[PDB]
Design a protein around this ligand. Structure first.
Ligand SMILES: [Ca+2]
Ligand SMILES: [Ca+2]
Ligand SMILES: [Ca+2]
Lengths: 227, 227, 227
C-alpha cells in the first residue's frame, strides 16, 4: 500500500509539477496557473520540457505570471572605464571593448542548453521586458540638461539596437533620469518591452558620453522577464 | 486492486490524451494520430502542453488532421457601415474605424494565454488556411463586372496584408464571387493558405468599395485551420 | 505486486524515455543528458513530443549531443547529368531540372509530420550543421587550379543560398577540395554551420561547371545535424 501511495503522489507530480529542482514546470505562468496559491519566489522552471534535469532557477512574479531570469553576472562595477582623448565623444560597446557581454541563467549549464531553454521562452512567450540601470558620475545617460537633448543618450544591443530615438518599435523608454547634469554619481533606469520577445535580452551597452577623466560609471543588469 | 486499476487508466491517459477538457492532446493531428478512429467533432487540444488547465476548444477535421479555431465573435452583421462622401472610394479598416478586430479561441482565457497557445500552433504547424465570407448588397468584393477588374477588390490583414494582386506569396484566392454586380445582397468567399502559418489568422478586413448610401455589407469569419 | 512493478517501470520510462521506438526522447542531447552512458547509435527521438507514435529514427552523436538526420535518399549517383552546349557554363539546379530535391527523415511518415518534427528541431536547436560531398570527373567544385578562383564554385539551397563568396553569414566552407583540376573523378566536401538552424537542411545543389561531354558527377548527402 505504501508503494501505491508513493506512485500516486509521483504521478500527481507528473501531471502538475511543483516548481522544485526535482519537479519543475514549463513557465512561471503555468506554475501560477496550476498552483494559483504559490507566492512569488525562486522556483525551477524547464521551458524545453523533455528531460527534467536541465531546468533553470528563475524568479516567478506570481502576480503577473512573468518568468524572470536574473542575469549573470548581475552588475558591472563603478569605474572610469574609458579614455576621453577625442574632442568628439563616440559610442562604445562595453562588452566589445575594454568589457563583457551579459549572460543569462545558470552558470552550471552549457551554452547550447542555456540557449535553447532561453530560446523557447524567448521565442514562445506573450511578451518580454527588461530593466537596466546606468550608475553615473559626470556622465549623461539620456537627457542632457543643457541641450535638453538625447543626442548623448546611450544604446543597448537587444540582439537589434535599442536607442532613445529612431524607429519607435526599437526605442527604449526611460523610467527615471538622474544622470542629466554633470556635477558630482547618479542613476538612470532604462526599459525595453515588446511582443517580439526574440529581441531580448540585453546583451551589450554603449555609452555615448564616456572616457572623460572626470567621467565614471557602473551598471547593474535587471532580469529579462517573459510573460 | 481498485486503486491500481484507477492508476493504470490514469497513466494510460497520460501517455495518450483523449481530447477532453480533462485530458487534452497537442494538436488535432496527434489526437488523429493516436486515436485514428475518433470522428471530427469538438475536441480539447493544448498546444503549449505543460499545464493541462489552459487548453482550447477547437474543431478537429479528423480527416485532414487540421486543427480549426472558430473565431470569436464569429460574424459581423449586415449594415451600411460607412460613409460615401468622397467621389473617390478608398479602403477602410473595419476594425480600425467605425469596427472591431477578430479574436480567436476561448473567451475565458487571458490574452497572454490565448496568444501563446495560438503562437505555438501558428509558429509550429505544417501549414495554415482560413476562409472568410463578405456578404454584400450593391458592393463589389473582388471582381467588378463592368471593368472586369479587381481594382475594387478588398484587403485583409493577415498579421502582413492579403490583396487580390501584388506579390504572389501574399495574394488571397477567391472561392466564389457573388458580389460582382451592383444591383439588389450577395456573398463572396476568400481564402488564404500558406506554409508560413505565422501569417495567419485574419484579424482585420478592408473594403475598397464602401459607404454608398446604397451600399451595405456583413461578414462571417471562418476558423483559422492549422495542419 | 507484479502489476505494481509493471506500473512503476512504466512510470519511470515516462519521466525519462530511453530512445526506443516505444519510448523516444526529445533530442539526442537530452537522451545524452538523461542517459549519460548511452553510446552513439541509432536512437528514436520525438521533437514535437506529444503523441509518441510519430518519432523519427535519428543518429545520436552522443559525444556532442547532436541529433543527426540521415537524408533520404542518401546519394545521387555518378553520371554526366547535363548538357554542355553553351560556350558559357551556367549554374543549374539538379532538383529543379533534369533531378530531385533532398528529403530528410522517415519515408513512412507524412510530409506534414516530417515537416513539424524537423521544424521544431530546426526552429529550436542551439545550432545546426550539414556536410555534403561532390564527386567529380573533369569538373571544378570550388577552386579552379588554373584561375586560382572560386568563380566556378557551385551553390547550395539552404532554404537561402549558400555560395563560396558573398555575404559571410551565407558562405559555405570547404573541408577538402579534390575537384580543382580537370584531368581524369575526385571528391570535394562542403559544409554549412550556423546558429540560425532555420537555414538548414540543404535541399538543392547547383554546379556551375557542368554538362561537358567530358564532365561527370555524383553526390552523397551527409545528415543535417542539430545541437
Ligand atoms: Ca529540459
Ligand atoms: Ca497548457
Ligand atoms: Ca510526436
Amino acid at each position: 500500500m505504501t508503494s501505491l501511495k508513493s506512485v500516486n503522489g509521483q504521478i500527481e507530480s507528473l501531471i502538475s509539477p511543483d516548481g522544485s529542482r526535482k519537479n519543475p514546470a514549463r513557465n512561471c505562468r503555468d506554475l501560477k496557473f496550476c498552483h494559483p496559491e504559490l507566492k512569488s519566489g525562486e522556483y525551477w522552471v524547464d521551458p524545453n520540457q523533455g528531460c527534467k534535469l536541465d531546468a533553470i532557477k528563475v524568479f516567478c512574479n506570481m502576480e503577473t505570471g512573468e518568468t524572470c531570469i536574473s542575469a549573470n553576472p548581475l552588475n558591472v562595477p563603478r569605474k572610469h572605464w574609458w579614455t576621453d582623448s577625442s574632442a568628439e565623444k563616440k559610442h562604445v560597446w562595453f562588452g566589445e571593448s575594454m568589457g563583457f557581454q551579459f549572460s543569462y541563467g545558470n552558470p552550471e549549464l552549457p551554452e547550447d542548453v542555456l540557449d535553447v531553454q532561453l530560446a523557447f521562452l524567448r521565442l514562445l512567450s506573450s511578451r518580454a521586458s527588461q530593466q537596466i540601470t546606468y550608475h553615473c558620475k559626470n556622465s549623461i545617460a539620456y537627457m542632457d540638461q543643457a541641450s535638453g537633448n538625447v543626442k548623448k543618450a546611450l544604446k543597448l544591443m537587444g540582439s537589434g539596437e535599442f536607442k532613445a530615438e529612431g524607429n519607435s518599435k526599437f526605442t527604449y523608454t526611460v523610467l527615471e533620469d538622474g544622470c542629466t547634469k554633470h556635477t558630482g554619481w547618479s542613476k538612470t533606469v532604462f526599459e525595453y518591452r515588446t511582443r517580439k520577445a526574440v529581441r531580448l535580452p540585453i546583451v551589450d551597452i554603449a555609452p555615448y558620453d564616456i572616457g572623460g577623466p572626470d567621467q565614471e560609471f557602473g551598471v547593474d543588469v535587471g532580469p529579462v522577464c517573459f510573460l
